[PDB]
Amino acid sequence: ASRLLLNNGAKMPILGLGTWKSPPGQVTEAVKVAIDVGYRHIDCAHVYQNENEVGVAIQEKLREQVVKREELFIVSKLWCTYHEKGLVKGACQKTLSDLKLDYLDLYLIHWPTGFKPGKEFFPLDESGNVVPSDTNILDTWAAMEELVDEGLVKAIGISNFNHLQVEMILNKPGLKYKPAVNQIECHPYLTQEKLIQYCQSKGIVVTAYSPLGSPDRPWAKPEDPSLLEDPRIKAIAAKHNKTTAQVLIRFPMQRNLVVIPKSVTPERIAENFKVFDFELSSQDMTTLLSYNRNWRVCALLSCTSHKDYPFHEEF
Ligand SMILES: NC(=O)c1ccc[n+]([C@@H]2O[C@H](COP(=O)([O-])OP(=O)(O)OC[C@H]3O[C@@H](n4cnc5c(N)ncnc54)[C@H](OP(=O)(O)O)[C@@H]3O)[C@@H](O)[C@H]2O)c1
Ligand SMILES: O=C(O)Cc1nn(Cc2nc3cc(Cl)ccc3s2)c(=O)c2nccnc12
């Protein structure tokens, strides 16, 4: 089905548009095209530095009577420099102001790591280490719960949390709301079998990010692996008369994941949506899972000694 049920009773569309690295000058048109072709879920974040331009697109389509607000599923995220309990509400309200909305469908803790508060998204010491903050996941979570109580967000969740970090929230004394979603990197080179099994077993929906392997990530090398150019995945696409991107988007859907491919290119936005008219076989699924290499595109070397760095754990 085209939507998954969350723990608040809301239905989250299984396909969403990603917006990381969508330049402000191009993203408004990307969002408008996405809504026209049928996307009803947009994945946003303060750190993407383009929420105003995403907001413009949403407002235009609401005013054109293309969609009403209740048919859209808008996700944003709390950046690392705002983990302090007293900064969370302001951060959420700023995102809401930028998006020109009065509520979010889902608001995520972007990373488990708190960074020193300030103007810089990535505060670095003179040696290039990220400067942490004196914050912890449980206290941040309590501040996230308050946003639900106040009516600013319908659901809260996490992103880039490992299973122990998820467990820490689940076992919080006085927990008010369980996390609805854990958004994690997921693709054929990083299949995340253990963490997905964990999260699904705990009734947390998983969203797969970078499903095409983020070929526009800033730290890519032309030598690095390329899912969209992997000849084995091209073969699977050819067999179904689909593109490699369509195979990579359908793959997580058949694992009961939400998936959020990014594009600012209208043709690709439309292409990427054409994934509801075919099915990958059992063999195809097994084959794509067999490509796992624990190859992670989203991490920073500069964050690896943070107490809450998520990727030292096996899962
Ligand atoms: N929670 C987190 O920490 C986190 C981390 C990473 C990502 N995310 C979310 O997940 C989203 C998706 O991940 P991502 O942006 O890293 O990368 P991605 O969706 O895996 O790949 C995006 C790249 O693929 C290209 N592309 C898109 N569709 C294509 C197609 N049909 N044919 C060929 N190329 C295609 C895009 O080009 P063009 O745009 O130029 O067309 C862009 O270069 C993000 O935008 C963000 O919303 C979250
Ligand atoms: O956080 C994202 O959604 C993607 C993202 N990912 N990354 C890599 C990161 N890895 C980590 C690892 C940690 Cl532990 C904390 C924050 C980050 S951000 C970036 O450097 C970055 N820079 C600007 C905007 N988006 C990003």
mmCIF file of C-alpha atoms and ligand atoms in Angstrom:
data_model
loop_
_atom_site.group_PDB
_atom_site.id
_atom_site.type_symbol
_atom_site.label_atom_id
_atom_site.label_comp_id
_atom_site.label_asym_id
_atom_site.label_seq_id
_atom_site.Cartn_x
_atom_site.Cartn_y
_atom_site.Cartn_z
ATOM 1 C CA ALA A 1 0.000 0.000 0.000
ATOM 2 C CA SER A 2 1.035 3.586 -0.584
ATOM 3 C CA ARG A 3 0.998 4.636 3.106
ATOM 4 C CA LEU A 4 2.225 3.152 6.438
ATOM 5 C CA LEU A 5 0.431 3.600 9.774
ATOM 6 C CA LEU A 6 2.279 5.484 12.535
ATOM 7 C CA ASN A 7 1.739 5.176 16.293
ATOM 8 C CA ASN A 8 -0.423 8.359 16.292
ATOM 9 C CA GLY A 9 -2.906 6.863 13.792
ATOM 10 C CA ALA A 10 -1.628 9.006 10.894
ATOM 11 C CA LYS A 11 -0.802 7.480 7.510
ATOM 12 C CA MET A 12 2.686 8.316 6.230
ATOM 13 C CA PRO A 13 3.108 8.189 2.419
ATOM 14 C CA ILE A 14 5.689 5.529 1.575
ATOM 15 C CA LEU A 15 7.325 7.736 -1.127
ATOM 16 C CA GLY A 16 8.564 11.204 -0.313
ATOM 17 C CA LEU A 17 10.714 13.854 -1.933
ATOM 18 C CA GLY A 18 14.105 14.479 -0.380
ATOM 19 C CA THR A 19 15.519 18.050 -0.306
ATOM 20 C CA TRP A 20 19.112 17.820 0.926
ATOM 21 C CA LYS A 21 21.349 19.581 -1.649
ATOM 22 C CA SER A 22 18.321 20.977 -3.520
ATOM 23 C CA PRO A 23 19.562 24.576 -4.037
ATOM 24 C CA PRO A 24 17.151 27.307 -2.862
ATOM 25 C CA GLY A 25 17.099 28.661 -6.419
ATOM 26 C CA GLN A 26 15.839 25.305 -7.791
ATOM 27 C CA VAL A 27 13.863 23.595 -4.981
ATOM 28 C CA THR A 28 10.653 25.618 -5.270
ATOM 29 C CA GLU A 29 10.102 24.301 -8.773
ATOM 30 C CA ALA A 30 11.099 20.779 -7.677
ATOM 31 C CA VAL A 31 8.505 20.774 -4.901
ATOM 32 C CA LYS A 32 5.769 22.197 -7.131
ATOM 33 C CA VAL A 33 6.419 19.505 -9.757
ATOM 34 C CA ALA A 34 6.546 16.807 -7.081
ATOM 35 C CA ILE A 35 3.116 17.831 -5.774
ATOM 36 C CA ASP A 36 1.713 17.945 -9.295
ATOM 37 C CA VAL A 37 2.858 14.430 -10.117
ATOM 38 C CA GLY A 38 1.576 12.970 -6.815
ATOM 39 C CA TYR A 39 4.149 13.197 -4.049
ATOM 40 C CA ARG A 40 2.425 13.905 -0.742
ATOM 41 C CA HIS A 41 5.433 13.680 1.556
ATOM 42 C CA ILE A 42 8.367 16.065 1.647
ATOM 43 C CA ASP A 43 11.493 15.471 3.755
ATOM 44 C CA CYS A 44 12.987 18.766 4.975
ATOM 45 C CA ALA A 45 15.552 19.955 7.490
ATOM 46 C CA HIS A 46 16.823 23.220 8.920
ATOM 47 C CA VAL A 47 20.399 22.247 8.001
ATOM 48 C CA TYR A 48 19.396 21.942 4.306
ATOM 49 C CA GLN A 49 19.140 25.743 4.289
ATOM 50 C CA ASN A 50 16.240 25.737 1.815
ATOM 51 C CA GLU A 51 13.083 25.448 4.013
ATOM 52 C CA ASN A 52 11.869 28.911 2.999
ATOM 53 C CA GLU A 53 11.882 27.882 -0.673
ATOM 54 C CA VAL A 54 10.161 24.597 0.061
ATOM 55 C CA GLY A 55 7.574 26.600 2.007
ATOM 56 C CA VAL A 56 6.944 28.887 -0.972
ATOM 57 C CA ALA A 57 6.133 25.847 -3.145
ATOM 58 C CA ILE A 58 3.744 24.345 -0.595
ATOM 59 C CA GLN A 59 1.918 27.646 -0.060
ATOM 60 C CA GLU A 60 1.507 28.179 -3.786
ATOM 61 C CA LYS A 61 -0.037 24.749 -4.284
ATOM 62 C CA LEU A 62 -2.338 25.167 -1.268
ATOM 63 C CA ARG A 63 -3.501 28.512 -2.674
ATOM 64 C CA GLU A 64 -3.970 27.005 -6.184
ATOM 65 C CA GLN A 65 -6.242 24.350 -4.578
ATOM 66 C CA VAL A 66 -4.016 21.535 -5.869
ATOM 67 C CA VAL A 67 -3.809 19.943 -2.423
ATOM 68 C CA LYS A 68 -5.052 20.768 1.034
ATOM 69 C CA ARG A 69 -2.769 20.740 4.011
ATOM 70 C CA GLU A 70 -4.245 17.578 5.542
ATOM 71 C CA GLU A 71 -3.240 15.597 2.411
ATOM 72 C CA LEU A 72 0.465 16.563 2.803
ATOM 73 C CA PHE A 73 2.943 14.829 5.107
ATOM 74 C CA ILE A 74 5.694 17.336 5.917
ATOM 75 C CA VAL A 75 8.743 16.182 7.874
ATOM 76 C CA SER A 76 11.491 18.343 9.315
ATOM 77 C CA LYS A 77 14.335 17.810 11.748
ATOM 78 C CA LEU A 78 15.980 19.404 14.792
ATOM 79 C CA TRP A 79 19.606 20.234 14.079
ATOM 80 C CA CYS A 80 22.438 19.182 16.389
ATOM 81 C CA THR A 81 23.120 22.691 17.693
ATOM 82 C CA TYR A 82 19.613 22.871 19.218
ATOM 83 C CA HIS A 83 19.626 19.785 21.482
ATOM 84 C CA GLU A 84 19.422 21.828 24.664
ATOM 85 C CA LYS A 85 15.934 21.445 26.182
ATOM 86 C CA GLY A 86 15.303 25.187 26.135
ATOM 87 C CA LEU A 87 16.305 25.592 22.447
ATOM 88 C CA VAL A 88 14.121 22.860 20.959
ATOM 89 C CA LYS A 89 10.843 24.818 20.786
ATOM 90 C CA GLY A 90 12.498 27.819 19.109
ATOM 91 C CA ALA A 91 14.122 25.577 16.540
ATOM 92 C CA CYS A 92 10.765 23.978 15.729
ATOM 93 C CA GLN A 93 9.039 27.358 15.546
ATOM 94 C CA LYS A 94 11.739 28.663 13.200
ATOM 95 C CA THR A 95 11.298 25.674 10.886
ATOM 96 C CA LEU A 96 7.532 26.225 10.954
ATOM 97 C CA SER A 97 8.010 29.935 10.125
ATOM 98 C CA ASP A 98 10.328 29.084 7.197
ATOM 99 C CA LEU A 99 7.991 26.369 5.832
ATOM 100 C CA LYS A 100 4.992 28.730 6.350
ATOM 101 C CA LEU A 101 3.115 26.009 8.228
ATOM 102 C CA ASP A 102 1.265 25.822 11.500
ATOM 103 C CA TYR A 103 2.229 22.205 12.247
ATOM 104 C CA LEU A 104 4.600 19.443 11.102
ATOM 105 C CA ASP A 105 3.416 15.920 10.510
ATOM 106 C CA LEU A 106 6.703 14.559 11.867
ATOM 107 C CA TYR A 107 9.670 16.172 13.557
ATOM 108 C CA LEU A 108 12.900 14.188 14.010
ATOM 109 C CA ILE A 109 15.992 14.477 16.108
ATOM 110 C CA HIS A 110 18.351 14.734 13.087
ATOM 111 C CA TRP A 111 21.359 13.060 14.718
ATOM 112 C CA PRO A 112 21.898 11.698 18.267
ATOM 113 C CA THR A 113 24.866 14.025 18.726
ATOM 114 C CA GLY A 114 24.439 17.456 20.273
ATOM 115 C CA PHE A 115 26.813 20.148 19.013
ATOM 116 C CA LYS A 116 27.791 23.396 20.715
ATOM 117 C CA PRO A 117 24.987 25.930 20.273
ATOM 118 C CA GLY A 118 25.748 28.916 18.095
ATOM 119 C CA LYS A 119 25.596 30.328 14.572
ATOM 120 C CA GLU A 120 27.672 27.552 12.935
ATOM 121 C CA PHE A 121 25.964 24.348 11.857
ATOM 122 C CA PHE A 122 29.230 22.442 12.383
ATOM 123 C CA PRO A 123 31.195 24.209 15.144
ATOM 124 C CA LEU A 124 34.772 23.061 14.783
ATOM 125 C CA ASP A 125 37.769 23.506 17.058
ATOM 126 C CA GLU A 126 41.066 24.665 15.511
ATOM 127 C CA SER A 127 41.954 20.974 14.929
ATOM 128 C CA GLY A 128 38.730 20.248 12.996
ATOM 129 C CA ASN A 129 36.926 18.196 15.675
ATOM 130 C CA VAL A 130 33.256 18.976 16.109
ATOM 131 C CA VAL A 131 32.639 20.726 19.415
ATOM 132 C CA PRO A 132 29.929 18.792 21.358
ATOM 133 C CA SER A 133 27.264 20.147 23.693
ATOM 134 C CA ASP A 134 26.443 19.041 27.214
ATOM 135 C CA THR A 135 23.192 17.454 26.118
ATOM 136 C CA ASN A 136 21.841 13.932 26.168
ATOM 137 C CA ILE A 137 19.276 12.107 24.107
ATOM 138 C CA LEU A 138 16.761 11.617 26.931
ATOM 139 C CA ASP A 139 16.515 15.302 27.829
ATOM 140 C CA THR A 140 16.250 16.271 24.175
ATOM 141 C CA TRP A 141 13.492 13.708 23.761
ATOM 142 C CA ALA A 142 11.543 15.215 26.658
ATOM 143 C CA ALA A 143 11.703 18.607 24.898
ATOM 144 C CA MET A 144 10.483 16.924 21.669
ATOM 145 C CA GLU A 145 7.502 15.456 23.558
ATOM 146 C CA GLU A 146 6.497 18.967 24.641
ATOM 147 C CA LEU A 147 6.123 19.938 20.963
ATOM 148 C CA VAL A 148 3.469 17.263 20.571
ATOM 149 C CA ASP A 149 1.683 18.360 23.723
ATOM 150 C CA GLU A 150 1.669 21.951 22.368
ATOM 151 C CA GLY A 151 0.220 21.027 18.993
ATOM 152 C CA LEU A 152 3.260 22.052 16.883
ATOM 153 C CA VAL A 153 3.969 18.551 15.572
ATOM 154 C CA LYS A 154 1.775 15.487 15.189
ATOM 155 C CA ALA A 155 4.521 12.904 15.681
ATOM 156 C CA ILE A 156 8.135 12.814 16.744
ATOM 157 C CA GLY A 157 10.963 10.499 15.880
ATOM 158 C CA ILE A 158 14.653 10.005 15.479
ATOM 159 C CA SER A 159 17.244 9.759 12.770
ATOM 160 C CA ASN A 160 20.636 8.021 12.631
ATOM 161 C CA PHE A 161 19.989 6.308 15.989
ATOM 162 C CA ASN A 162 21.510 2.915 16.607
ATOM 163 C CA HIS A 163 19.579 0.211 18.398
ATOM 164 C CA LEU A 164 20.970 1.048 21.827
ATOM 165 C CA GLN A 165 20.029 4.708 21.359
ATOM 166 C CA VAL A 166 16.499 3.672 20.284
ATOM 167 C CA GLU A 167 16.365 1.403 23.339
ATOM 168 C CA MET A 168 17.424 4.288 25.613
ATOM 169 C CA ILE A 169 14.371 6.332 24.500
ATOM 170 C CA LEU A 170 12.002 3.370 24.724
ATOM 171 C CA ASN A 171 13.173 2.710 28.268
ATOM 172 C CA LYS A 172 13.042 6.400 29.359
ATOM 173 C CA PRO A 173 11.339 6.695 32.740
ATOM 174 C CA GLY A 174 8.218 8.736 32.299
ATOM 175 C CA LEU A 175 8.292 8.313 28.489
ATOM 176 C CA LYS A 176 5.265 10.212 27.144
ATOM 177 C CA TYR A 177 5.401 9.444 23.372
ATOM 178 C CA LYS A 178 7.279 6.587 21.638
ATOM 179 C CA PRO A 179 9.320 7.595 18.551
ATOM 180 C CA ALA A 180 7.180 7.000 15.476
ATOM 181 C CA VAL A 181 10.039 6.752 12.939
ATOM 182 C CA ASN A 182 13.760 6.132 12.732
ATOM 183 C CA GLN A 183 15.169 7.605 9.494
ATOM 184 C CA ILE A 184 18.397 5.871 8.533
ATOM 185 C CA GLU A 185 20.659 5.461 5.514
ATOM 186 C CA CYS A 186 19.533 2.411 3.528
ATOM 187 C CA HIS A 187 20.391 1.048 0.092
ATOM 188 C CA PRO A 188 21.859 -2.116 -1.489
ATOM 189 C CA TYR A 189 25.377 -1.321 -0.203
ATOM 190 C CA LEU A 190 24.085 -0.676 3.363
ATOM 191 C CA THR A 191 21.035 -2.855 3.850
ATOM 192 C CA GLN A 192 20.634 -2.403 7.613
ATOM 193 C CA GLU A 193 18.989 -5.796 8.175
ATOM 194 C CA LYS A 194 19.525 -5.901 11.939
ATOM 195 C CA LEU A 195 18.532 -2.326 12.733
ATOM 196 C CA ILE A 196 15.427 -2.545 10.525
ATOM 197 C CA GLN A 197 14.351 -5.807 12.146
ATOM 198 C CA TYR A 198 14.882 -4.179 15.549
ATOM 199 C CA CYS A 199 12.940 -1.041 14.805
ATOM 200 C CA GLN A 200 10.079 -2.826 13.044
ATOM 201 C CA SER A 201 9.792 -5.303 15.950
ATOM 202 C CA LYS A 202 9.352 -2.280 18.287
ATOM 203 C CA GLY A 203 6.626 -0.756 16.079
ATOM 204 C CA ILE A 204 8.830 2.039 14.756
ATOM 205 C CA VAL A 205 8.528 2.820 11.075
ATOM 206 C CA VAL A 206 11.844 3.053 9.201
ATOM 207 C CA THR A 207 12.522 5.617 6.507
ATOM 208 C CA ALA A 208 15.372 4.853 4.085
ATOM 209 C CA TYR A 209 17.437 7.894 3.150
ATOM 210 C CA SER A 210 20.056 8.179 0.380
ATOM 211 C CA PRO A 211 18.343 5.262 -1.497
ATOM 212 C CA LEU A 212 20.202 6.066 -4.694
ATOM 213 C CA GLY A 213 23.498 6.260 -2.730
ATOM 214 C CA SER A 214 23.633 10.077 -2.705
ATOM 215 C CA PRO A 215 25.818 10.573 -5.784
ATOM 216 C CA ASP A 216 25.775 14.375 -5.181
ATOM 217 C CA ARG A 217 27.080 14.036 -1.601
ATOM 218 C CA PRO A 218 29.856 16.627 -1.190
ATOM 219 C CA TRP A 219 32.583 14.187 -0.158
ATOM 220 C CA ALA A 220 32.114 11.666 -2.990
ATOM 221 C CA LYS A 221 35.070 10.543 -5.038
ATOM 222 C CA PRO A 222 34.574 9.507 -8.710
ATOM 223 C CA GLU A 223 36.296 6.207 -7.709
ATOM 224 C CA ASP A 224 33.674 5.440 -5.024
ATOM 225 C CA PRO A 225 30.841 2.935 -5.569
ATOM 226 C CA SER A 226 27.869 4.152 -7.613
ATOM 227 C CA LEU A 227 24.510 2.401 -7.212
ATOM 228 C CA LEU A 228 22.933 4.085 -10.203
ATOM 229 C CA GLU A 229 25.805 2.846 -12.393
ATOM 230 C CA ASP A 230 26.086 -0.655 -10.857
ATOM 231 C CA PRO A 231 25.755 -2.998 -13.857
ATOM 232 C CA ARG A 232 24.043 -5.665 -11.755
ATOM 233 C CA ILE A 233 21.282 -3.271 -10.794
ATOM 234 C CA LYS A 234 21.058 -2.030 -14.394
ATOM 235 C CA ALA A 235 20.387 -5.659 -15.373
ATOM 236 C CA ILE A 236 17.561 -5.950 -12.856
ATOM 237 C CA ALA A 237 16.049 -2.691 -14.172
ATOM 238 C CA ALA A 238 16.302 -3.812 -17.826
ATOM 239 C CA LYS A 239 14.442 -7.016 -17.047
ATOM 240 C CA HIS A 240 11.478 -5.013 -15.709
ATOM 241 C CA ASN A 241 11.737 -2.247 -18.351
ATOM 242 C CA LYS A 242 12.433 0.289 -15.576
ATOM 243 C CA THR A 243 15.321 2.580 -14.700
ATOM 244 C CA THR A 244 17.934 1.824 -12.081
ATOM 245 C CA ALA A 245 16.517 4.637 -9.949
ATOM 246 C CA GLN A 246 13.074 3.011 -10.091
ATOM 247 C CA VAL A 247 14.534 -0.332 -8.917
ATOM 248 C CA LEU A 248 16.395 1.358 -6.054
ATOM 249 C CA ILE A 249 13.220 3.163 -4.904
ATOM 250 C CA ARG A 250 11.018 0.074 -5.163
ATOM 251 C CA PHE A 251 13.518 -2.024 -3.181
ATOM 252 C CA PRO A 252 12.905 -0.357 0.224
ATOM 253 C CA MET A 253 9.162 -0.146 -0.424
ATOM 254 C CA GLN A 254 9.043 -3.980 -0.601
ATOM 255 C CA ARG A 255 10.773 -4.120 2.795
ATOM 256 C CA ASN A 256 7.948 -1.981 4.270
ATOM 257 C CA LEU A 257 10.192 1.079 4.475
ATOM 258 C CA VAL A 258 9.378 4.652 3.620
ATOM 259 C CA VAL A 259 11.778 6.005 0.998
ATOM 260 C CA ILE A 260 12.750 9.615 0.185
ATOM 261 C CA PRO A 261 14.715 9.955 -3.101
ATOM 262 C CA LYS A 262 15.953 13.446 -3.852
ATOM 263 C CA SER A 263 15.877 15.240 -7.154
ATOM 264 C CA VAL A 264 15.546 18.802 -8.401
ATOM 265 C CA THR A 265 15.213 17.648 -12.005
ATOM 266 C CA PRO A 266 11.535 17.608 -13.111
ATOM 267 C CA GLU A 267 11.960 14.595 -15.427
ATOM 268 C CA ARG A 268 13.560 12.555 -12.655
ATOM 269 C CA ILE A 269 11.016 13.683 -10.055
ATOM 270 C CA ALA A 270 8.351 12.242 -12.356
ATOM 271 C CA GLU A 271 10.392 9.100 -13.167
ATOM 272 C CA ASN A 272 11.029 8.402 -9.503
ATOM 273 C CA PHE A 273 7.274 8.340 -8.784
ATOM 274 C CA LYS A 274 6.600 5.615 -11.365
ATOM 275 C CA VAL A 275 7.276 2.759 -8.954
ATOM 276 C CA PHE A 276 3.749 1.518 -8.158
ATOM 277 C CA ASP A 277 3.168 -0.476 -11.370
ATOM 278 C CA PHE A 278 5.767 -3.253 -10.940
ATOM 279 C CA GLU A 279 7.131 -5.575 -8.318
ATOM 280 C CA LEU A 280 10.639 -6.873 -7.722
ATOM 281 C CA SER A 281 10.709 -10.691 -7.514
ATOM 282 C CA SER A 282 11.900 -12.636 -4.484
ATOM 283 C CA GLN A 283 15.111 -13.369 -6.403
ATOM 284 C CA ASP A 284 15.586 -9.686 -7.196
ATOM 285 C CA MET A 285 15.118 -8.737 -3.543
ATOM 286 C CA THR A 286 17.520 -11.418 -2.345
ATOM 287 C CA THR A 287 20.041 -10.314 -4.967
ATOM 288 C CA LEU A 288 19.856 -6.635 -3.981
ATOM 289 C CA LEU A 289 20.196 -7.536 -0.305
ATOM 290 C CA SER A 290 23.271 -9.618 -1.207
ATOM 291 C CA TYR A 291 25.112 -6.428 -2.354
ATOM 292 C CA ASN A 292 25.478 -5.175 1.219
ATOM 293 C CA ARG A 293 29.018 -3.970 1.972
ATOM 294 C CA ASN A 294 28.350 -1.876 5.121
ATOM 295 C CA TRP A 295 29.221 1.082 2.920
ATOM 296 C CA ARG A 296 27.988 4.205 4.553
ATOM 297 C CA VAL A 297 27.895 7.510 2.643
ATOM 298 C CA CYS A 298 26.589 9.626 5.499
ATOM 299 C CA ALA A 299 28.984 10.102 8.332
ATOM 300 C CA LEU A 300 31.662 12.660 9.240
ATOM 301 C CA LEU A 301 35.112 11.796 10.433
ATOM 302 C CA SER A 302 34.999 14.976 12.540
ATOM 303 C CA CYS A 303 32.139 13.563 14.739
ATOM 304 C CA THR A 304 33.620 10.110 15.538
ATOM 305 C CA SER A 305 34.662 10.645 19.152
ATOM 306 C CA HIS A 306 31.336 12.165 20.251
ATOM 307 C CA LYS A 307 29.855 10.165 23.111
ATOM 308 C CA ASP A 308 26.701 9.725 21.058
ATOM 309 C CA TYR A 309 28.357 8.915 17.692
ATOM 310 C CA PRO A 310 25.994 6.242 16.366
ATOM 311 C CA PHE A 311 28.077 4.082 14.045
ATOM 312 C CA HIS A 312 30.559 2.343 16.336
ATOM 313 C CA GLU A 313 27.851 -0.150 17.351
ATOM 314 C CA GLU A 314 27.221 -3.144 15.082
ATOM 315 C CA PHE A 315 23.667 -1.813 14.603
HETATM 316 N N1 LIG B 1 18.427 12.036 8.183
HETATM 317 C C1 LIG B 1 19.589 12.228 7.628
HETATM 318 O O1 LIG B 1 20.634 12.320 8.259
HETATM 319 C C2 LIG B 1 19.648 12.250 6.135
HETATM 320 C C3 LIG B 1 20.854 12.023 5.493
HETATM 321 C C4 LIG B 1 20.868 11.996 4.112
HETATM 322 C C5 LIG B 1 19.702 12.173 3.384
HETATM 323 N N2 LIG B 1 18.516 12.430 4.022
HETATM 324 C C6 LIG B 1 17.262 12.655 3.247
HETATM 325 O O2 LIG B 1 17.184 11.682 2.220
HETATM 326 C C7 LIG B 1 17.105 12.369 0.959
HETATM 327 C C8 LIG B 1 17.663 11.508 -0.141
HETATM 328 O O3 LIG B 1 19.061 11.226 0.082
HETATM 329 P P1 LIG B 1 20.206 11.986 -0.727
HETATM 330 O O4 LIG B 1 19.785 13.367 -1.058
HETATM 331 O O5 LIG B 1 21.438 11.800 0.088
HETATM 332 O O6 LIG B 1 20.423 11.168 -2.082
HETATM 333 P P2 LIG B 1 19.682 10.197 -3.068
HETATM 334 O O7 LIG B 1 18.233 10.503 -3.048
HETATM 335 O O8 LIG B 1 20.144 8.830 -2.827
HETATM 336 O O9 LIG B 1 20.349 10.679 -4.446
HETATM 337 C C9 LIG B 1 20.102 12.018 -4.950
HETATM 338 C C10 LIG B 1 20.945 12.198 -6.179
HETATM 339 O O10 LIG B 1 20.496 11.274 -7.198
HETATM 340 C C11 LIG B 1 20.168 12.021 -8.364
HETATM 341 N N3 LIG B 1 19.008 11.422 -9.002
HETATM 342 C C12 LIG B 1 17.728 11.449 -8.508
HETATM 343 N N4 LIG B 1 16.865 10.760 -9.203
HETATM 344 C C13 LIG B 1 17.612 10.277 -10.259
HETATM 345 C C14 LIG B 1 17.259 9.467 -11.360
HETATM 346 N N5 LIG B 1 16.015 9.055 -11.606
HETATM 347 N N6 LIG B 1 18.225 9.214 -12.267
HETATM 348 C C15 LIG B 1 19.472 9.639 -11.996
HETATM 349 N N7 LIG B 1 19.917 10.394 -10.992
HETATM 350 C C16 LIG B 1 18.925 10.645 -10.131
HETATM 351 C C17 LIG B 1 19.932 13.436 -7.912
HETATM 352 O O11 LIG B 1 20.190 14.349 -8.995
HETATM 353 P P3 LIG B 1 19.376 15.700 -9.283
HETATM 354 O O12 LIG B 1 18.756 16.205 -7.953
HETATM 355 O O13 LIG B 1 20.393 16.700 -9.919
HETATM 356 O O14 LIG B 1 18.330 15.277 -10.295
HETATM 357 C C18 LIG B 1 20.959 13.577 -6.825
HETATM 358 O O15 LIG B 1 22.275 13.793 -7.339
HETATM 359 C C19 LIG B 1 17.823 13.683 1.218
HETATM 360 O O16 LIG B 1 17.615 14.635 0.175
HETATM 361 C C20 LIG B 1 17.245 14.047 2.589
HETATM 362 O O17 LIG B 1 15.906 14.498 2.410
HETATM 363 C C21 LIG B 1 18.484 12.423 5.397
HETATM 364 O O1 LIG B 2 22.236 15.538 7.941
HETATM 365 C C1 LIG B 2 21.777 15.246 6.805
HETATM 366 O O2 LIG B 2 20.591 15.049 6.576
HETATM 367 C C2 LIG B 2 22.728 15.099 5.683
HETATM 368 C C3 LIG B 2 24.089 15.676 5.923
HETATM 369 N N1 LIG B 2 24.997 14.807 6.282
HETATM 370 N N2 LIG B 2 26.269 15.266 6.482
HETATM 371 C C4 LIG B 2 27.177 14.260 7.027
HETATM 372 C C5 LIG B 2 26.955 14.165 8.520
HETATM 373 N N3 LIG B 2 27.368 13.168 9.235
HETATM 374 C C6 LIG B 2 27.126 13.402 10.600
HETATM 375 C C7 LIG B 2 27.480 12.576 11.662
HETATM 376 C C8 LIG B 2 27.133 12.990 12.914
HETATM 377 CL CL1 LIG B 2 27.447 11.900 14.212
HETATM 378 C C9 LIG B 2 26.412 14.131 13.188
HETATM 379 C C10 LIG B 2 26.082 14.978 12.152
HETATM 380 C C11 LIG B 2 26.413 14.587 10.862
HETATM 381 S S1 LIG B 2 26.059 15.405 9.385
HETATM 382 C C12 LIG B 2 26.691 16.571 6.302
HETATM 383 O O3 LIG B 2 27.885 16.871 6.518
HETATM 384 C C13 LIG B 2 25.679 17.538 5.931
HETATM 385 N N4 LIG B 2 25.999 18.854 5.741
HETATM 386 C C14 LIG B 2 25.023 19.673 5.421
HETATM 387 C C15 LIG B 2 23.709 19.249 5.285
HETATM 388 N N5 LIG B 2 23.380 17.968 5.396
HETATM 389 C C16 LIG B 2 24.371 17.080 5.728
#
